[PDB]
Amino acid sequence: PELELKYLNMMKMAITGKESICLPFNFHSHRQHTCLDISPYGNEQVSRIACTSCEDNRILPTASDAMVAFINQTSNIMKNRNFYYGFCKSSELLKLSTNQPPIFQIYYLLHAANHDIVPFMHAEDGRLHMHVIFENPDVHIPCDCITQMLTAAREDYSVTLNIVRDHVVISVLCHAVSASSVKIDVTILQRKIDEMDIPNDVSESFERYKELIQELCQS
Ligand SMILES: [Zn+2]
């Protein structure tokens, strides 16, 4: 007889809330309090209200937490190593990123949720773009994560989730570079990136995607 409230617990059962999405999916078409779970069953949009493929009680960093991380890039090089491998050792692309904090911010937010991601960097017309490649086909983007990505990008970027080569890619496209309100010491960052050893397997991974990277590198 320890159950009087054992039947009252489920104060809110949730099943109905899902919906199918059409690709290429532009993140401007968000649904306020919903997520994105991409599986082989199809592409859908389910709310935290309904979705229990969630961070039980685990918290996610805000766009602000990502900006502070951006400001402290130089201190956390080896933590953010995956991000920097995306520049393919290119130093021009690196100084471009120091002018565009949302590029790092969006990666920081995406990495926080999904750790198994491959970022790639490209530039046209003097603006930096980013393509995040998902290793697993069991893609899931939490609501909190998406909301923060929309805060990080806002008026300048076109974040788009699309599936090619039976894999998922989020394409961050910079349409304008309205000047940043902060500045990173670039020279310190650039010397520290040259100090980094590019591991064979990490460099071999790119050539496993080079049949696909150039296809995305048309913007
Ligand atoms: Zn979710």
Swiss-Prot record:
Cellular-component GO terms for this entry: host cell nuclear inner membrane; membrane
PTM remark: Phosphorylated at serine residues in the N-terminus. This phosphorylation regulates the localization within the inner nuclear membrane.
This protein's UniProt keywords: Host membrane, Host nucleus, Membrane, Metal-binding, Phosphoprotein, Zinc, Zinc-finger
Biological process terms in GO annotation: viral budding from nuclear membrane
Compartments where located: Host nucleus inner membrane
A molecular function (GO) term: zinc ion binding
Hydrolase recorded as keyword: no
This protein's record includes keyword Zinc: yes
Top-level division of the source organism's lineage: Viruses
Role, per record: Plays an essential role in virion nuclear egress, the first step of virion release from infected cell. Within the host nucleus, NEC1 interacts with the newly formed capsid through the vertexes and directs it to the inner nuclear membrane by associating with NEC2. Induces the budding of the capsid at the inner nuclear membrane as well as its envelopment into the perinuclear space.
Family to which the UniProt record says this protein belongs: Belongs to the herpesviridae NEC1 protein family.
Subunit structure: Forms a heterohexameric complex with NEC2. Interacts with capsid vertex specific component 2/CVC2; this interaction directs the capsid to the host inner nuclear membrane to initiate budding.
Protein name: Nuclear egress protein 1
Lineage start: Viruses, Duplodnaviria, Heunggongvirae, Peploviricota, Herviviricetes
Chain's gene name: NEC1
